């Protein structure tokens, strides 16, 4: 270990802001954070987004002042979630302390996706987990789905889920403030989102039982996900398969018709946190001789179906350093080294075809037609390399 590569947690803010509308995602700190968000967004900063960027006792007084400034400039916030960053946790600025004290309609909730603690997409983890604690408990068998998956495909997931025969959904990412997901002891919840380890842990900590979660990335990735959903709700096999075979066929045809040029490949997964799930997604269509698949944060947990359905070829190395991982990349010579960060494009500048993670994260790739173009996403660098060599 040594130097790291991946983004800090604030890159998940660009997705959380887009997905759940009535929310606030103000980060704190220096221009290094206010500029990662800026450049990553591109035009969001011009579209006047819903987040911001603020300018031990002195630090806490400044925290209170800046939170009041949030409440002032946007007098329409009721289910805000402040975002922590590296300096705030360096001086250990408790966002819960500011939220609880300054809640006295005005309900302030905390969240800390700081890259010193957080990683590439664990900001989503920390935020979705921070939704859970204060909320009370529900007392019925619902299916509390989770994850900030695209709303266009959130409709597909809800439609399929109700076709299974489930009760209420009440998705944990609060895209409406009124829609408050309670954490019930009888609540059985799946996991759409692979980087929801902290969220799943906190949801089970409050009491909600968790369903087996092979994460939904088309074909078996979502097959076993929704199968676990069905066998947990006791949906008849002939009911589930009847109402879900067509999405399976659509995704299977789409991935095959989108990965024609992805044959004879070695997809190195430098640390998206999708790495085990995407590694399994890239085994059957055409030829994907996957190689070392690292993550910025890995737990098997009950998230284990990834590794259970994963092969042994690609090394599941948790914790890495690009300053030697790229040496391993040179030695390996992987024909598509999808590299989250650290080196990234210079890999394409030293004869290594490179794919980048946030394209996968911020482009609908979850089951049906969404996972259908996951193959197209992974073919993007390859279809570039085929011509613009």
């Amino acid at each position: 270990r040594g130097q790291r590569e991946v983004f800090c947690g604030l890159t998940g803010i660009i997705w959380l802001h887009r997905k759940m509308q009535d929310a606030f995602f103000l980060v704190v700190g220096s221009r290094t954070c206010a500029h990662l968000l800026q450049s990553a967004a591109g035009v969001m900063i011009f579209a006047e987004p819903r987040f911001g960027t603020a300018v031990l006792a002195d630090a806490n007084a400044e925290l209170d002042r800046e939170v009041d400034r949030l409440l002032a400039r946007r007098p329409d916030i009721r289910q805000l979630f402040l975002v922590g960053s590296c300096p705030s946790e360096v001086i250990k600025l408790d966002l819960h302390r500011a939220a609880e004290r300054l809640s006295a309609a005005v309900r302030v909730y905390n969240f800390s996706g700081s890259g010193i603690e957080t990683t590439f997409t664990q900001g989503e983890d920390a935020c979705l987990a921070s939704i859970v604690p204060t909320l009370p408990a529900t007392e019925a068998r619902e299916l509390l789905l989770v994850g900030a998956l695209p709303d266009v495909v959130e409709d597909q997931a809800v439609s399929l889920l109700t076709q299974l025969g489930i009760g209420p959904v009440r998705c944990l990412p609060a895209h409406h403030a009124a829609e408050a997901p309670g954490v019930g002891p009888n609540t059985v919840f799946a996991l759409v989102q692979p980087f929801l380890g902290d969220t799943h842990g906190a949801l089970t900590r409050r009491g909600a039982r968790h369903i087996a979660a092979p994460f939904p990335f088309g074909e078996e990735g979502t097959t076993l996900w929704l199968k676990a959903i069905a066998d947990e709700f006791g949906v008849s096999a002939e009911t589930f398969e009847a109402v879900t075979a067509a999405p399976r066929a659509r995704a299977r045809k789409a991935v095959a018709a989108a990965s024609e040029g992805l044959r004879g490949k070695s997809v190195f997964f430098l640390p998206s946190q999708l790495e085990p799930s995407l590694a399994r997604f890239l085994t059957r269509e055409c030829g994907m001789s996957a190689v070392e698949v690292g993550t910025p944060f890995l737990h098997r947990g009950i998230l284990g179906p990834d590794l259970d359905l994963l092969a042994e070829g690609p090394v599941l190395s948790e914790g890495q350093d690009v300053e030697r991982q790229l040496d391993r990349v040179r030695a390996a010579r992987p024909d598509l080294t999808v590299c989250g960060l650290g080196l990234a494009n210079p890999l394409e500048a030293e004869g290594f075809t490179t794919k980048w993670a946030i394209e996968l994260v911020f482009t609908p790739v979850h089951f049906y037609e969404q996972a259908g173009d996951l193959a197209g996403l992974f073919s993007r660098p390859v279809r570039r390399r085929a011509i613009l060599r």
């Binding site: 290094t32 800026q38 011009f46 210079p346």
Partner: protein, 418 residues
């Protein structure tokens, strides 16, 4: 509460500098997430080299003296990686303002001069001094008072990577100097080598390109290396001619100026360039560019300068110097909200400046172009886009009048057929 930040943090400028210096490295205690700027110079300024600046990325399990140990571990590993030519130390200050600087193993390398270090002031800077405290240190240490070579030589000082069209400014000024007979010993701030930066004595006078980063280097070099710099700037026809006067005066050579190419003074003299007479124009952006552009506007363009505010208020007096030159005052604030308010108040017809002012004017209907530093990928171009010299004055016409083409042809279309 800056939803958009004009310039980056004070480390991205140092990385800008080191990107054009093949070999020179910079040990920065930047947590993972501060490595987003490792993208900038291959993502925004799409190049093909990982920035030569060390990163440590100390995590949560690494707070305190552990960061001090990671400083030395990263330094040693970075040296063993590619055998640098110089090492610069400095932190993002977040958990350690001044409290892990550890030269112990940064020195004891094959590096002749290990005292090289860039400390950037805490929460008081942007992407100008990041590249300016570069050449106040990296050229204050590894640059020798070498003998002035036989022909009258010079140094192209100032241009840093991820800079506004700096790579083409370099070629235009080098072409001017070579056609005038002035040798260019090295383009030291950009596209150079540590051997070239050591060769700063073989230059009869530094040729300054912009105060943004090269002003400190030029002032120090004239003070120390005994080679004066060009106090004028080659942005603008009159400024270009005065720059030629200065370079030839300090050279002792003929003021050869290739104005054959120059077309702004004429293209701003046609009667298409008469309907722009008195057009109120707002000018926000970096001081060097704003002063040069506003002089050009006010006298030779036809526009009337109604705004000259800036965000580089460090050298505050030379800002309002040109404002009294035009009879105005300077908005030296550092927020785009004030820019929006000022352009709403004066309702100009051209809001020449950053991409942020570009998007304000897109949202406020006013025409606008890019003349300033805070720009994204599209304003760091592949084409030959030099903002300095005679061709710099040439591009400063078309760049400024394309938004007027917008604001005129759009108006005609929307008013003719409705």
């Amino acid at each position: 509460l800056t939803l958009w930040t004009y310039e980056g943090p004070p480390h991205v400028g140092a990385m800008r500098v080191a990107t054009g210096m093949t070999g020179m490295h910079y040990v920065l205690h930047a947590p993972q997430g501060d490595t987003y700027a490792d993208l900038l110079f291959t993502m925004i300024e799409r190049r093909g080299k990982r920035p030569p600046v060390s990163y440590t990325t100390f995590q949560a399990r690494d707070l305190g003296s552990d960061t001090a140990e990671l400083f030395q571990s990263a330094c040693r590993d970075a040296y063993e990686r590619f055998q640098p030519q110089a090492i610069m130390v400095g932190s993002s200050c977040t958990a350690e303002l001044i409290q892990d600087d550890t030269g112990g193993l940064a020195d004891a390398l094959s590096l002749p001069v290990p005292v090289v270090h860039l400390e950037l002031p805490s929460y008081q800077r942007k992407e100008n001094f990041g590249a300016d405290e570069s050449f106040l240190q990296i050229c204050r240490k590894l640059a020798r008072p070498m003998e002035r070579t036989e022909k009258v030589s010079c140094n192209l000082l100032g241009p840093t990577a991820l800079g506004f069209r700096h790579r083409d400014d370099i070629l235009e000024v080098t072409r001017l100097l070579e056609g005038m007979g002035i040798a260019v010993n090295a383009v030291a701030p950009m596209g150079a080598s540590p051997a070239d930066i050591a060769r700063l004595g073989a230059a009869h006078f530094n040729v300054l390109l912009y105060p943004e980063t090269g002003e400190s280097a030029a002032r120090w070099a004239e003070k120390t290396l005994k080679q004066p710099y060009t106090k004028t700037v080659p942005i603008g026809v009159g400024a270009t001619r005065d720059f030629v006067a200065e370079v030839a005066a300090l050279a002792g050579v003929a003021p050869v100026a290739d104005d054959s190419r120059l077309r702004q003074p004429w293209w701003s003299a046609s009667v298409d360039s008469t309907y722009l007479t008195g057009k109120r124009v707002f000018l926000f952006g970096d001081a060097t560019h704003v002063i040069a552009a506003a002089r050009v506007a006010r006298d030779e363009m036809g526009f009337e300068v109604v705004g000259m505010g800036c965000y580089n208020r460090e050298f505050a007096r030379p800002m309002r110097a040109a404002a009294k030159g035009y009879g105005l005052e300077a908005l030296v604030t550092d927020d785009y909200l004030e820019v929006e308010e000022a352009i709403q108040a004066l309702a100009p017809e051209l809001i020449l400046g950053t991409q942020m002012e570009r998007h304000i004017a897109k949202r406020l209907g006013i025409p606008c172009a890019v003349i300033s530093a805070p720009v994204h990928v599209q304003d760091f171009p592949a084409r030959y886009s030099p903002q300095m010299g005679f061709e710099g004055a040439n591009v400063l016409f078309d760049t400024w009048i394309h938004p007027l083409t917008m604001g005129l042809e759009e108006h005609l279309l929307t008013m003719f057929r409705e």
